[PDB]
């Protein structure tokens, strides 16, 4: 099974200038809990944005060019990325925009955080078709002293 995990600001913005400008510790904790002990697939730009391997996960990087770091696994196509995960119950696709586009048609589950924040961005999560997806979990949180925007965790499953 393939799942996508992402945090979206208003208008599906996910990034600006190869960064995420907000800081929501509760959402990073949600990301870690839902990805730990699973393989994670990311594109090269997202690898550079994170800047280090994510511990406790098999890190698989898509790039058309040879890898430059043997602490992670480098692959050259979507099918190779999936194969490199082996026989696991759930593969997590962690972006960015171009990678989400390619894996969305193959995904059974979306883990989305909706952040109540207006962000100028240059990268968006794909338009998906709402009729294709059932909401199976949602949890709203008001802003607090640690998290400066309200946010909603949602899990959707392909109908």
Ligand X SMILES: Nc1nc(=O)c2nc(CNc3ccc(C(=O)N[C@@H](CCC(=O)O)C(=O)O)cc3)cnc2[nH]1
65 binding ligand NAP? (CB under 6 A): yes
78 binding ligand NAP? (CB under 6 A): yes
What's the alpha-carbon Rg for the chain, to the nearest Å? 15
* Positions 87 through 106 that interact with Mn ion (CB under 5 A): 87
Minimum separation from the CB atom of position 74 to ligand NAP (A): 9
- Whether the upstream peptide bond of residue 20 has omega within 30° of 0, thus cis, is no
Distance CA 15, CA 121 (A): 5
Pick the closer one to Mn ion by CB: 116 or 122. Answer: 116
Asked if residue 56 belongs to a known ligand binding site, the reply is: no
Distance CA 46, CA 57 (A): 15
Minimum separation from the CB atom of position 80 to ligand NAP (A): 8
Distance CA 58, CA 91 (A): 10
The candidate with the shortest Cα–Cα distance to 62, out of 97, 87, 109, 29, is 97
| Contact (CB, 8 A) for 9 and 117 | yes
* Positions 1 through 60 that interact with ligand NAP (CB under 6 A): 6-7, 14-15, 18-20, 42-46, 49
Pick the closer one to ligand NAP by CB: 12 or 159. Answer: 12
Asked if residue 109 belongs to a known ligand binding site, the reply is: no
Which residues of the chain form contacts with ligand NAP (CB under 6 A)? 6-7, 14-15, 18-20, 42-46, 49, 62-65, 76-78, 94-99, 102, 123
């Amino acid at each position: 099974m393939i799942s996508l995990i992402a945090a979206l600001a208003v208008d599906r913005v996910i990034g600006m200038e190869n960064a995420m400008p907000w800081n929501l510790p509760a959402d990073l904790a949600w990301f870690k809990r839902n990805t730990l002990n699973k393989p994670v697939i990311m594109g090269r730009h997202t690898w550079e944005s994170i800047g280090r391997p994510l511990p406790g996960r098999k890190n698989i990087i898509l790039s058309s060019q040879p890898g430059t770091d043997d602490r992670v696994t480098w692959v050259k196509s979507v099918d190779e990325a999936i194969a490199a995960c082996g026989d696991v119950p759930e593969i997590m696709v962690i972006g960015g925009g171009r990678v989400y586009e390619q894996f969305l048609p193959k995904a059974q589950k979306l883990y989305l955080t909706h952040i109540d924040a207006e962000v100028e961005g240059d990268t968006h999560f794909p338009d998906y078709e709402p009729d294709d997806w059932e909401s199976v979990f949602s949890e709203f949180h008001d802003a607090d002293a640690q998290n400066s925007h309200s946010y909603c965790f949602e899990i959707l499953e392909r109908r």
